[PDB]
Structure formats: structure tokens, C-alpha cells
Symmetry: D2
Subunit: 237 residues, 4 copies
């Protein structure tokens, strides 16, 4: 049903569905079994920053995740998104918890998309930047358990009043306007997404992760995509 391209910050190793034995960042092209992963030294309670970049000339989706004072983790995958996605897509953030949990807090999110045509000076562009989320964020489509406004942050999954993360939670936030990522006259199409997050768990084993994703405009959370499926995929195939 949905077409999903995502960059996951997977906190919990589900080795039975192909995760490596550690937190990792991965690039998912229509399956939760990442096409490429990289070890991520996830820091519980620390604010991290993820940068995702791509352009149609190189056809390489790359992501860099870093924590202050720490070395970054980066993952890249050669993929032509014109062959995977529709030309009009929606971009968003997704997160889930299952039996194990963590807060999936987003403190800021910026995205820039550019479609440059072969006509001189013809660039179409979309850019949004959120450094504060209000309770009435009308330009975001919140799905599942995602809420905004709490300390001006976006909480992708359920957090009880006392700051505790809840299990079996799934939430997604998508920018309201469709994003144009391909057009017949485009000579170069590119996008850049950056978001800072705070994954905090009272447990030694947080789960399940946050994912930046791009999908068909009408994408909705697949039934049963809590836990390991990151609110992105209906099954683990």
C-alpha cells in the first residue's frame, strides 16, 4: 500500500529481522530491513541531530547523526528515488515504542527541497523550519500518538504526565503541503532535512526508534506498526 523511503535511528536491535546487534542508523527503501546500516552510539537522554541529504544527479541518499562532543555516524545508499517514490510526496517523522520504550521527542525540524529546471533562473523551492511546535500546529498532520505543544516540542509517541515514555505507542507528524521531488523539466532535484531529537528511556534497553520518512501523500500508519516496525511498515518483509 504505502511507498516508504526512510532513514531510521533504530535504538533496538531486532536481529531476527536483520538488525545488527547494536543501535544503528539505516536506510529503508520500502522494507524495515535496511538496505544499509551503520553503528550508532546512541546516547540516552542526550539531544542528537540527524542530517539527511539527497540530489537526483548523484542519486545517493546519505544521513549523518551526531551528538555534541561525540563522533558522528553516517550511512549512505545509492538509490534513485524517482524510481521508488511518486513525484509528489509528503515528508515526515515517525516513531514507535513496543514492549521496550523511550521518549521520541523532536525539538526542531527543517526541510528544504529544490527542483531546478532547464529554464534559466527557474528554481522551484520549498523550505520549512520548526524550532518550536505549538499545540495548534496547523501545518503538520499528526497521526497516531504524536502531539505538539508540550514544552514547545513534538512528542511522536505517548509520554505520561510525569515524563515517562509509554510502550506500544506509534506516532507520525507530516508537513501539510505535498513536496514535489521530480518533474519532467528538472535538471537537478535535491532535498536536505535536519531534525534534533531527544530519546530518553528509564530502561537499559530503549526501543524502538525514530525515522525520517518520505511517502505517498496519503500515507497513514499501517495497522500493527508499533514496536519494531517504526510506524512505517505493515510487516517485517
Amino acid at each position: 500500500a504505502d511507498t516508504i523511503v526512510a532513514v531510521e535511528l533504530d535504538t533496538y536491535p531486532n536481529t531476527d529481522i536483520g538488525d545488527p546487534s547494536y543501535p544503528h542508523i539505516g536506510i529503508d527503501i520500502k522494507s524495515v530491513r535496511s538496505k544499509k546500516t551503520a553503528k550508532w552510539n546512541m546516547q540516552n537522554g542526550k539531544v542528537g541531530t540527524a542530517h539527511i541529504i539527497y540530489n537526483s544527479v548523484d542519486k545517493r541518499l546519505s544521513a549523518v547523526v551526531s551528538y555534541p562532543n561525540a563522533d558522528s555516524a553516517t550511512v549512505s545508499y545509492d538509490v534513485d528515488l524517482d524510481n521508488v517514490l511518486p513525484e509528489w510526496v509528503r515528508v515526515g517523522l515517525s516513531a514507535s515504542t513496543g514492549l521496550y520504550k523511550e521518549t521520541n521527542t523532536i525539538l526542531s525540524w527543517s526541510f528544504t527541497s529544490k527542483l531546478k529546471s532547464n529554464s534559466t533562473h527557474e528554481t522551484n523551492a520549498l523550505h520549512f523550519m520548526f524550532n518550536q511546535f505549538s499545540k495548534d500546529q496547523k501545518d503538520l498532520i499528526l497521526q497516531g500518538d504524536a502531539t505538539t505543544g508540550t514544552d514547545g516540542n513534538l512528542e511522536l509517541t505517548r509520554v505520561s504526565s510525569n515524563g515517562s515514555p509509554q510502550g506500544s505507542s506509534v506516532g507520525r507528524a507530516l508537513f501539510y503541503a505535498p513536496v514535489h521531488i521530480w518533474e519532467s523539466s528538472a535538471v537537478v532535484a535535491s532535498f536536505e532535512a535536519t531534525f534534533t531529537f531527544l530519546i530518553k528511556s528509564p530502561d537499559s534497553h530503549p526501543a524502538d526508534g525514530i525515522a525520517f520518512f518520505i511517502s505517498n501523500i496519503d500515507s497513514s500508519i499501517p495497522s500493527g506498526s508499533t514496536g519494531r516496525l517504526l510506524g512505517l511498515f505493515p510487516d517485517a518483509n
Copy 2:
């Protein structure tokens, strides 16, 4: 019903509803009878550029319209938009023709909105730029007779196959995402809009004009707003 704040490029003088006896640019705050106008030496068949700027500290909405090789026309009006508009609005372009006509072609449109909060480094921003419009422009809400794709332009009003403008036409195009123009913690809110247009008429008297407007998110063309009402207002009060 709708709350409209608009900057009009009025090509036809309807002196009975307060227009001056010449093409003029004006600032309309909830009425077609401009609060302030300035003579506009409209050039039939030439591509013009309109720049609209505003910020919540100065509370002055200003517009500058120019043609290559010609002197600009500028109009400014002191108005606090927080007292007029809702905090979530939609921005768009509107145009009409009545008994007299003209093409109301938009060749490019860019808009930048910024809400800076009192938290260090906390700027929320939205920016879109269209230098080419495709037939399937999913991020625009087209109302009335407005169409996109024709020579990669946005035609706000009806143009027949042979390039002739049609009379009694009204069309509007609004950016799909709501725009946040005020928030309790904002120290400065500002927006900038620029659009290039081509008004061409086979007649000595073109009508009726193009208007950049900001309105409540669910705004729709008022019944009978063709001609002098610019597809913006239901009557001439």
C-alpha cells in the same frame, strides 16, 4: 464571512467605489475600497514584479510594483495584521475580469514567512518559490477559473486557446499549507511576497486586476466577485 487583507494591482478605475481615475496599487483591509492607493503606470503586455513586505514590529504593510526600465510605484499602510487576521492564514493570488478583460498571468511567486521566538535560536519559517507551474501543482489550491501548466504559468482567469482573455472570469491560487503569522511567544513575525505578472489586454481599457491576499484558511471566492471585486470581496462596502 472571509477576512481579507490584500494588495491590489487594480487596472480599472471604478471611481464610484472609490478608485482613483487611473490604474493604481492599493492596500485593502477587509474592503475593496483601499485604505491607501498609489498611481500605477500599468504597462499592458509587459511583465511586472510586485514585492509585498510586512513585519510585526513596524506594523506597516508595504508594496512596490515595477516594470523593467520604468520607475516603481509603492504604497504603504500602517496596519497591525494581528488585529485583522487569524494567527493561521492562507496566502494567495486572485484576479478577475468583468465586462472589460485582460490576461492575469503569474509567471513566478515566492513567499517567505518567519516567526522568531524569544528563545535563543528559535525561528520558525516557511518559504516557497514557484518559477514554473506544472499542470499537476498539488501544493496550490486553485479556485474558480485559475489553471496551471499553460506555458508553465499560472493563469488566474480564463484565457481561450488563441490567447484571448475572457470576461466575467475570477480565479484564485492559494498555497496549500496554512501560514502561521502570530504566536504568543513571537518577538518578530515578518513575511515577504514577490510575484511577477503579465497583464495583457487587446483593449484600451483592461480590467480588473490582480491581488496578492492573505485570508482565513478556508477562504473561497465570494459569489459575484468577478469584475471590480477582484474575487476577494462579496460587495463593494
Copy 3:
């Protein structure tokens, strides 16, 4: 000699040269005696943010200074900068200490200047953003006691090893490239500057302040401009 237009964050009231009896923000047009001031509830040890905006259509230079969780202070002054400054200027930050002192630390600085011409799609722009300063910042001209790199910050005035601010210090940092703020064909010229600062003093009376300024490209610190003259003016006239 130098032509200076500055927005000062004056921490010390020198009532004999016209300062009000409190910390204030003011707009200085070629004199340290501000043309307009506003009370500033300066917060020692807290990071503040100053926003300065101006455009040639309105001819109003406005500044907003805020601290997290506190109400902002704003000052505006109607001034046509084309009548004061050359068309090519340098922009910078200046600060001083005299008998009383404070640290004049800059944590980030961004500036955007735009000159839009009457030719369709003809915008000239310059934008720089510094959120981290390195020891070898080659695109900044550091004058006086200003240094960069220390905790990735820009220290406008002398701070000894143990973090103590030094008295009788003056330092300025200017962006290396000249900025074009006027041109014969420009229909609208505008600039926006934002910088976050940390003024900390061990004393109950910090002095003297930080100022965002615009000057002739070859501007240098006037002899004896420590203390009340903010490293900007040669005397108090």
C-alpha cells in the same frame, strides 16, 4: 571620519551624555547620543538575542532584544540610511568596557542583505551565519581586543584566562566582504541581522555595552573609544 549607524545594547547609564538612568537599547546615527532609546531589562549572565531589521521602502531601523522567558524591548527610528551611509558598507559588532566591565561574548551572528532591482527576477543578496567561531576565522576582520575560537565564541573584549572580563577594553569584528546597501536601480533594499550575546559581569554595575553597527568599509576603532563610546565614536558629541 567614520560614518556609523549602530544599534546599541548599552548596559551602563552615562546620564551626562544623555543615557537614561537604566540599561537601554538605542539607535545611534553618527553620535553616541542615541536618537531613540528604550528601557532594556538587561540580564547579567543570561544569553540574549538581538534582531535588527530595515528596508528602504519604510526607512525604519528597528531592533528587538529578548531573553528567554522575558518580555522583549524594542526600539525603532525612522531613518533613511541612503542619506547617512555610503552605498558600500561593512557591518560588524563592537563592544567595550571602561572602569566598569563585563564580558561581551557573541555566540552567533547572522546577517542577510537583499537589493532587489526593477529587472524581473533580479535580486542581489548576501547572507552569512556564524553559529560557531574558530580561531582562524578569515572572513571576519577583528579589531582591538576581539578574539575568536575561545569556546567557539567571539569575545569582543578582553577576558582573562579565569573568565574574568577586563576593563578598558574595546574590540570589534566586521564581516570581511563589503555589503551593498543601495544601488540606482534598486526598488527595495533590506537587511536583517541577528546575534545572540552573553554579557556577564562579576559587578553590580556592568559596562559598557555591545553594538551592532554599519559603517564605511575602512572603519577602524577611534582612538579613546573604550568605555562609554562603545568602540564606535571618538567623542561624546
Copy 4:
């Protein structure tokens, strides 16, 4: 002496120094003998647009050159610029003519450089856009025969009063501020450059080409770099 990384739009095939037998675009890393080339169907008298992109995660310098209504030509090369260039560089445009000639007119030039650090929200950026060049362009360093102001364009090489291109001409224009392309704490460094050009020759064989280049900050035209050496290299090694 100088370290040059350039993307050339070579109009004249000098097969003896390795050029293919046609106009081509190539990526030059410290030698005029391109590391990679692509056939370019150069259109005499037409305005073209070149887009150059690069980021430190992928380490791929790519360029796309297009003409309205024509298919683009693109060339990419895997190169880690941190291993070639200094961390502070100057970016510019260069052009030459030899026995054969052409006008090397630049109508617009924009460049964006970004250095994102591992500290949350820490992006340093530089962006400039020139859509009109004036006679007194103080933020450009013009070398050789390059001049600005003529029809608001930048003429890299000599053009006589009657619009005729002159032979044995070499000119370069560099942005005044140094550009920071690497820093120890940077997690991702990227740049994007776009420029539109008009190469027009009265002859069937125009020469020699235009090149976008990045070099050590103090770069100057090598002696004898007219013609095939593009005002970039001292010899053909």
C-alpha cells in the same frame, strides 16, 4: 603554486592536451587535463546555466549544464576536496580566449556554502547571489580582463565596444570573502554554485571556455594562461 579545483565549460577541443573532439564540460583537479568529461552541446549565442554541487559526506563533485529547450549534460567525479584544497578558499569564475575567441559573459552567479557542526543547531553558512553586476562591484576581486557593469553583466574577457570578443584575453572574478570549506568539528560541509552564461562567437570555432573554480585565497592568474589553460593553470600538465 595555486591549488585549483575547477568545473570547466570547454568550448574548444585541444585534443593534444587530452580534450575530447567536441565541446565538453569537465572536472579539473589541479590540472587542465580533466579527470572526467562529458560531451556538451554548446549553443553559441544562447544563455546557459551551470549548477555545481558537492558535499563532504558523498565526496562527489557534480556539475549539470543546460540550455532552455535542450537536454542537459552532467559530469561527476568522486573527490574529497578536503584532501585537495585548504580549509579557507576563494571561489570564482574564470575564462579565456586565445587565437579563437568568444564572449565569456556571466549574467548571474549564486553560491551557497554550509558547514554543519556536531553541536545542535550549529550551522555556519555563506550565501551570495548576483543577478546584476554594477561597475563598482566591491565584493568581487576582478583579475585580468574581467569587467563588470556592462549591461549589468560580468564580462570575464575583453569585448570591444561593438560587442566583438577579443582574442588572447583572460579574466577572473572571485568573491571577496574567503569561504570556509572544512573545519575539525564539521559533520557535513556542502556548497552549491549556479551561474548563467552567454558564450557568443562570430566564428564557427569559439574558444576557450568558462570555468567555475575554487582555489587558495591568494590565487592570481598564472602567467601565460590565456587560451587553452583557461586562466587557471600555468601549463598543460
